Amino acid sequence: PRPTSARQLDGIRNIVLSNPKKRNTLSLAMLKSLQSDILHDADSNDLKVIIISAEGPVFSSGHDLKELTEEQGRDYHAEVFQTCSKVMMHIRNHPVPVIAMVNGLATAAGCQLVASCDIAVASDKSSFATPGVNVGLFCSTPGVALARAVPRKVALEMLFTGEPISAQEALLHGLLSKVVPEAELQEETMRIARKIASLSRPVVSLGKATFYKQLPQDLGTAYYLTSQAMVDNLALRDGQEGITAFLQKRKPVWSH
Amino acid sequence: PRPTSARQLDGIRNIVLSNPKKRNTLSLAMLKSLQSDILHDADSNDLKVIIISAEGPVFSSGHDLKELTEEQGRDYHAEVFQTCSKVMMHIRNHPVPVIAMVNGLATAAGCQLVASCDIAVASDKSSFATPGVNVGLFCSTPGVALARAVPRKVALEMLFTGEPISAQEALLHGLLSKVVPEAELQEETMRIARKIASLSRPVVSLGKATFYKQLPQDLGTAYYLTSQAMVDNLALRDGQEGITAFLQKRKPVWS
Amino acid sequence: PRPTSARQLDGIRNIVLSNPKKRNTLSLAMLKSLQSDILHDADSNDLKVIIISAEGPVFSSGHDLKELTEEQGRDYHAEVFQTCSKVMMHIRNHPVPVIAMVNGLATAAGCQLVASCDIAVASDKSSFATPGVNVGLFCSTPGVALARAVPRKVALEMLFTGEPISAQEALLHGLLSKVVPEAELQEETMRIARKIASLSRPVVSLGKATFYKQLPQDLGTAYYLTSQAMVDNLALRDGQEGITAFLQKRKPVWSH
């Protein structure tokens, strides 16, 4: 048995949360299975892009609340939230783009995981909430990723009232990149995944890292940083292949 | 009597800007009255949430320009602005959440006050402007709040041109949490206020303070801050109550 | 012979990207011409606002890939991107507001430029994209302005996949200020520019500089800085003229 299942094919790794009976709860065990599937062979050139999806009608309900009862000890509580944050940080610092594919409810740390991904596609019936407050545990952790996804006015009404937002509201305020009918979720997600897998890994990997490095900077420093990265991109073989191909009106053949 | 009236029933403090004849101008006296009502008993457990509302069709027109003439002197000017900012800071840092209920025009510092609230619910007839430029006074202090509410491209047309946006546009760009027809403004606002009031104050309070602490950090620091906060929240009696109530399928009883 | 044309009338400078046969590509020579038109007489009181527009159906395609080929050397490559970054910074640090008036496609460094302006107005047929990746050159430079324009989830789909967003979407997500038919575009941009031109230069210029200074700060620092700028504004002659004029129910006559 294992709470995530993973499969990689034509550069696309799909990590499926596979405990629908437990509403794909981010138990310490599930988090570690997830961490493991994300890190596995992360620098292989054969890996181009990660999709994180879920089995069933709940993407994830968040943490296992039994693990956060008094008797488990504060050290164990610390471990749950730290392992979780470590995973969000792995995703952010990963060499490849990570995409959330959502087809139903993501709540609390489940909503955190969607928000932490580079891209997020959902079906129109999905919904997102941070309701820890209803069980006496403010979604503070989730609030980190939600604060960087949506406006404060949206985030604080989510966090203080525990009420969920629709997929269309998520799309409007920045939590998601795309929304489509359920029937098309897989075609739409694979459209983005395949496009990514069809590009140069080292160009896309430098693109991602650079983007998160410049993001918190002032404008001048953000531009020093990125300019210098364009110049480095140009010195890659795939950089010159890409330009040459364009100038010669033909398809680029990436070596990575 | 005073330019702000404050009542508190059942967790919910309603503070009304009650000077419609002067468009709820944020004169120094309006600001000190409001500060007073915000701060009063701020640590009392009977207070769970604050709603800031306004009497008349102008939520607030902003500062009183008569206070900003050359005759008052630069120190008076400094006091109006330092006092206005203190207030906004006191809301930011308040132990409980603060909600704006808006039924009309919020311009200049009045728009700033809307944007400084944690949650803001307006009627569909409402509008928001930063027209200081038109009276030679760039809306620099309102731009602080507006720059943290809306995209730059929206904030900057507002500030450079002084033209209002509608409540619809305000919702689309993040200045407001909710917009409803005016007939529904009070129930929509009380729906949120009551919800907040039915939760655990110390958990909501920890929640709000932590949120504002993590917001400006690098992501790693933000997770260090918040992970520790969660762990401390579990140590609260109401943390464990809410958890236990949930796993026993009942309503929780907060201390 | 210059790849930009600039004309100034009633305080409004229009700088027009005028190399449509090369889709207004941001070559080193276009960037220097553009830089020159922006900086020229920048402290003159007769200048009140800048509009950057373009000839023809592409606004700009971004940099000239020729570049950018290995043979040009890294110094030349660093020059293209450093000059582009300086242009961006000159727009931000300018004493007057700069409006982008966009009518068609704006791509890579072209999109950068748009998202670098203080206000942007676009015809409804306009569209925006950061397709570097397709030519092995990630839009790292453009992702600076884009990260500060739209939500991460929108920016990162755009960067990793290279698909345009339309002007409606750039409006919703914060790329643009206004979207109007192509037939309202000149008048709509002129409404903003004339309004600005009708205000006090010193007051607007103070506000613009103050705005970008407070923008990164913690909230306490932001209010310290702005409230001190409020007080400085009131010590300006046009500060007092505007306030008096309001209180006397008349129209302010600015001195600047």
CA distance B26 to B83: 10
Sign of CA dihedral C194, C200, C206, C211: negative
Measured CA to CA, the distance from residue A135 to residue A108 in angstroms comes to 11
CA distance, residue C253 to nearest chain A CA (Å): 36
Tokens of A86: 């470590």
H/E element holding C38? helix C28-39
Q: Tokens 């890996």 map to which residue? A: A47
User: What is the distance between the alpha carbons of residues A185 and A78, in angstroms, rounded to a whole number?
Assistant: 36
Size of chain A in residues: 256
How near does any CA of chain B get to the CA of C207, in Å? 6
Distance (Å, rounded) from C-alpha A161 to C-alpha B178? 13
B contacts of C246 (beta carbons < 8 Å)? 65, 134-135
**Residues C226, C231, C232, C233, CA torsion sign:** positive
Give the distance from residue B28's alpha carbon to the nearest chain A alpha carbon, in angstroms. Answer: 27
Cα–Cα distance measured from residue C170 to residue C127, given in angstroms and rounded to the nearest whole number? 8
CA distance linking residue A121 with residue A177, whole number of Å: 6
Distance CA C53, CA C122 (A): 10
Phi-psi region of A104 (alpha: psi -120 to 50; beta: other; left: phi over 0): left
Q: Quick one: angle between helices C109-116 and C74-92, nearest 10? A: 20
Comparing CA positions, the residue from C164, C184, C191 lying closest to residue C62 is: C164
Cα separation of A122 and A128, whole Å?
Answer: 10
Question: Which of B82, B89, B144 is the best substitution to test chain C (most C C-beta atoms within 10 A)?
Answer: B144
State the pairing for strand pair B127-129/B165-166.
antiparallel
- Token pair, residue C153, equals 């989830």
Residue C141: both structure tokens together: 């430079």
Whole-angstrom CA distances from A64 to A69, B63, B100, B227, C28 are: 10, 51, 35, 15, 57
Distance CA B37, CA B39 (A): 6
Q: What are phi and psi of C143, to 5 degrees?
A: -60, -20
Give the integer Cα–Cα distance in Å for B131 and C99: 19
Task: Note the residue count of chain C.
Answer: 256
- Give the C window 213-252 contacts with A, CB below 8 Å: 216
User: Tokens 């990514």 sit at which residue?
Assistant: A196
**Is C133 within 8 Å of C212 (Cβ atoms)?**
no
Residue B137 to residue C224, Cβ atoms within 8 A: no
Q: Which residues neighbour B142 within 8 Å (Cβ) at sequence distance 6 or greater?
A: B62, B108, B109, B111, B112, B115, B130, B132
* DSSP label at residue C175: S
Distance CA A176, CA A189 (A): 12
Q: Which of A102, B152, B81 is nearest to C222 (CA)?
A: B81
- Chain A: partners with 3+ C-beta pairs within 8 Å: B, C
Distance (Å, whole) CA C214 – CA C220 = 10
Single out the residue of A142, A88, A23 nearest to residue A3, CA to CA.
A23
Give the separation between CA C230 and CA C235, rounded to whole angstroms. Answer: 9
Paired tokens of A147: 């604060």
CATH 1.10.12.10 residue ranges of chain B are 200-255
- CA dist., res. B4 & res. B33, Å (int): 6
Q: Which of A159, A161, A216 shows the shortest C-beta gap to B211?
A: A159
Q: Report CB contact under 8 Å: B157, C244.
A: no
- CATH level 3 topology of B200-255: Lyase 2-enoyl-coa Hydratase; Chain  A, domain 2 (1.10.12)
State the CB neighbour count (10 A cutoff) for residue A11. 19
Please, are residues A110 and A24 in contact by the beta-carbon 8 Å criterion?
yes
Q: A4: part of which helix (H) or strand (E)?
A: strand A4-9
8 Å CB contact of C252 and B148: no
Answer for the pair A227, C81: CB distance below 8 angstroms, yes or no.
yes
From which experimental method does this structure derive?
Answer: X-ray
The CA-atom distances, in angstroms, between A202 and each of A256, B2, C180, C238 are: 6, 66, 40, 55
Residue A134 is classified by DSSP as G
Q: At what angle do helices B152-161 and B140-147 cross, to 10 degrees?
A: 160
Residues of chain A with CATH 1.10.12.10: 200-256
Stretch(es) of chain A classified as CATH 3.90.226.10: 1-199
Name the 3-class secondary structure at A53: strand
- Distance between CA atoms of residues C203 and C115, nearest Å: 24
Sheet of B12-17, strand order: B4-9, B12-17, B49-54, B98-102, B119-123, B178-180
- The span from the CA of C179 to the CA of B210, in Å, is 39
Report the DSSP pairing between strands A178-180 and B4-9.
unpaired
Query: What CA–CA distances, in Å, run from C31 to A25, B100, C42?
Result: 53, 47, 17
Flag whether residue B28 sits within 8 Å of chain C, measured between CB atoms: no
End-to-end CA distance of chain B: 37
CATH pick for B1-199 out of 3.40.640.10, 3.90.226.10, 3.40.50.880, 3.40.1350.10: 3.90.226.10
Taking CB atoms and an 8 Å limit, are B153 and C175 in contact across chains? yes
Residue type, B246: F
Q: Is B98 helix (H, G, I), strand (E, B) or coil?
A: strand
Of the candidates B35, B24, B141, the residue with the CA atom closest to the CA atom of residue B90? B35
Whether the Cβ atoms of residue A5 and residue A32 lie closer than 8 Å to each other? no
Nearest partner of C70 among A231, A246, A229, judged by Cα? A231
A75 CB near a chain B CB, below 8 Å? no
C3: left (phi over 0), alpha (psi -120 to 50) or beta: alpha
CATH homologous superfamily of A200-256 equals Lyase 2-enoyl-coa Hydratase, Chain  A, domain 2 (1.10.12.10)
Interface membership of A147 toward B (CB under 8 Å): yes
The burial class, CB within 10 Å (0-12 / 13-18 / 19+), for B183 is: exposed
d(CA A89, CA A38): 11
What token pair was written down for A107? 């709540």
For residue B214, which residues of chain A lie inside 8 Å, CB to CB?
140, 143-144, 147
**Residues with Cβ within 8 Å of residue C86, at least 6 apart in sequence:** C35
Rounded to 5 degrees, φ, ψ at A248 are -90, 15
Contacts of B67 (CB under 8 A, 6+ apart): B27, B28, B76, B77, B80
- Residues of A within 8 A of B227 (CB-CB) are 78, 81-82, 84-85, 141
Residue B122 CA to residue A181 CA, distance in Å, equals 32
Query: d(Cα C38, Cα C14) in Å, to the nearest integer?
Result: 10
Residues of B in contact with C223 (CB under 8 A): 85, 88-89, 141, 144
Stretch 89-108 of chain B: residues touching chain C, C-beta under 8 Å: 89, 92
The length of chain B in residues reads: 255
Tokens of B190: 């009380």
Smallest Cα distance from A76 to chain B, Å: 9
Cα distances (angstroms) measured from residue B126 to each of B135, B164, B185: 22, 10, 11
Spatial separation of the C-alpha atoms in residues A76 and A69, rounded to whole Å: 10
Q: Pull the structure tokens for residue C43.
A: 């402290």
Buried b (16+ CB within 10 A) or exposed e, B48-71: bbbbbbbbbebbbbbbbbebbbee
Expressed in Å, this structure's resolution amounts to 2.3
User: What's the one-letter identity of residue B56?
Assistant: G
The reply to whether C22 touches chain A by the CB within 8 Å rule is: no
DSSP B66: G
Nearest to B229 among A65, A133, A140 (CB): A140
- CA–CA separation, A163 and A105 (whole Å): 12
- Nearest-CB residue to C81 (from A119, A230, A240): A230
Q: Select the residue from A144, A158, A171, A173 to test the B interface by mutation, using most B Cβ atoms within 10 A.
A: A144
Cβ count near A119 (within 10 Å): 27
* Burial class, C38, CB count within 10 angstroms (exposed 0-12 / middle 13-18 / buried 19+): buried
List chain C residues with CB under 8 Å of B118.
none
User: 3-state class of C20 per DSSP?
Assistant: helix
- Residue A69 touches chain B, beta carbons under 8 Å: yes
Cα–Cα distance, C139 to C150 (Å, whole number): 15
Residue C105, φ and ψ in degrees, nearest 5: -90, 140
User: Which residues in chain A have their CB less than 8 angstroms from residue C168's CB?
Assistant: none
- Nearest-angstrom CA–CA distance, C121 and A96: 35
Q: Give the distance from residue B30's alpha carbon to the nearest chain C alpha carbon, in angstroms.
A: 18
CB A227 within 8 A of CB C78: yes
Beta-bridge partners for A179: A122
DSSP per-residue string spanning C188-221: HHHHHHHHHHTS-HHHHHHHHHHHHHHTTS-HHH
- Which are the contacts of B183, defined by CB distance < 8 A and separation ≥ 6? none
Contact between B149 and B116 (Cβ < 8 Å): no
Token digits of residue A77? 């509580």
Contact B160 C230 (CB under 8 A): no
Residue B224's CB is within 10 A of a number of other CB atoms, namely 15
Residue A190 at interface with chain C, using a CB cutoff of 8 Å: no
Order of strands across the sheet that contains B58-60: B58-60, B105-107, B127-129, B165-166
Q: Are C155 and C146 in contact (CB under 8 A)?
A: yes
Q: Distance between CA atoms of A168 and A122, rounded to whole angstroms?
A: 9
Name the H helices within chain B.
28-39, 74-92, 109-116, 140-147, 152-161, 167-173, 185-197, 201-214, 219-235, 237-247
Cα torsion C191, C197, C201, C203: sign: negative
Q: Which two tokens stand for residue C204?
A: 């607007």
Q: Which residue carries 């550069």 as its tokens?
A: A11
CA distance C253 to C200: 9
Residues in chain C closer than 8 A to A236 (CB atoms) = 136
Q: Contacts of residue B81 in chain C, CB cutoff 8 Å?
A: 227, 230-231
Q: Do A176 and C157 touch (CB under 8 A)?
A: no
Shortest CA distance from B112: residue in chain C: C223
Cβ contacts of C123 within 8 Å, gap of 6 or more = C102, C103, C104, C167, C179, C180, C181, C182, C185
